[PDB]
Amino acid sequence: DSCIFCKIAQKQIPSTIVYEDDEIFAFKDINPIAPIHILVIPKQHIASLNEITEENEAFIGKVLYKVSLIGKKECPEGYRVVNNIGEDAGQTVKHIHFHILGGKKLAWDKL
Amino acid sequence: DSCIFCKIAQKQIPSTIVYEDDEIFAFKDINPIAPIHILVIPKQHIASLNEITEENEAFIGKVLYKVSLIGKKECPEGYRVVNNIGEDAGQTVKHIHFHILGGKKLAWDKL
Numbered sequence A, B: 001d002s003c004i005f006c007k008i009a010q011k012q013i014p015s016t017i018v019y020e021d022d023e024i025f026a027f028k029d030i031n032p033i034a035p036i037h038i039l040v041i042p043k044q045h046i047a048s049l050n051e052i053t054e055e056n057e058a059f060i061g062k063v064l065y066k067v068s069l070i071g072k073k074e075c076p077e078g079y080r081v082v083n084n085i086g087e088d089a090g091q092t093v094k095h096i097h098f099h100i101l102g103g104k105k106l107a108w109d110k111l
């Protein structure tokens, strides 16, 4: 009812869809920082990486596996995966999302 | 015998250790790009995220869980987790390593 990414996952708010299945939903970042910039979310609401538990760690491993399958397909020359937790990382939406970044030789600059 | 991170994990090459257990090894990046910059590796040799399989996905979930435990302790104000796969991402060592970055409001710049 409230979470922007939960709603995107249920196609209640529009997105450019890259992949979806019963468990995950991947779509293009609307403000990209690389030529390929994809967000991968679980459909289920998990607020951040700090909400991973010993009991859901297998599920998050499966999400990361599916992140790799998307990345190796969309970015055969290589890709970077980023996850932001909390204020210093600039986490905006409190629904866990993996960034897949690629399509160029990606910078590695001081943060 | 050959992999720099396998050797660091077995303390055959020195590092500044942040945490270790029977499964993982975490140490300070020697060329940091943030005030807190930690590398977390499995002790077992896995070359990159592209080597995750349906059969080891639970293990990688556990590694990511332990990444979150390290991050929330070392970076209570928030942290970014990064993984680089292949040439465009600039992956140097072919032994999977998660970057934990924090200690400041981290930039989000074009790559």
Ligand SMILES: Nc1ncnc2c1ncn2[C@@H]1O[C@H](COP(=O)(O)O)[C@@H](O)[C@H]1O
Residues within 6 Å of the ligand: A015, A027, A028, A029, A030, A031, A032, A039, A083, A084, A089, A090, A091, A092, A093
């Ligand atoms: N409605 C949206 N559709 C697609 N991407 C979005 C939308 N709203 C925010 N984003 C992206 O979501 C990301 C949030 O990343 P983070 O800083 O890790 O919370 C940013 O890269 C935003 O550009």
Ligand SMILES: Nc1ncnc2c1ncn2[C@@H]1O[C@H](COP(=O)(O)O)[C@@H](O)[C@H]1O
Residues within 6 Å of the ligand: B015, B027, B028, B029, B030, B031, B032, B039, B083, B084, B089, B090, B091, B092, B093
């Ligand atoms: N001997 C070392 N000890 C600690 N960190 C290292 C060492 N060699 C390389 N690194 C770091 O490992 C990281 C490799 O990251 P990547 O570009 O993702 O392959 C870089 O941030 C390097 O500064």
Ligand SMILES: [Zn+2]
Residues within 6 Å of the ligand: A003, A004, A005, A006, A007, A044, A045, A046, A094, A095
């Ligand atoms: Zn949500």
Ligand SMILES: [Zn+2]
Residues within 6 Å of the ligand: B003, B004, B005, B006, B007, B044, B045, B046, B094, B095
């Ligand atoms: Zn190794």
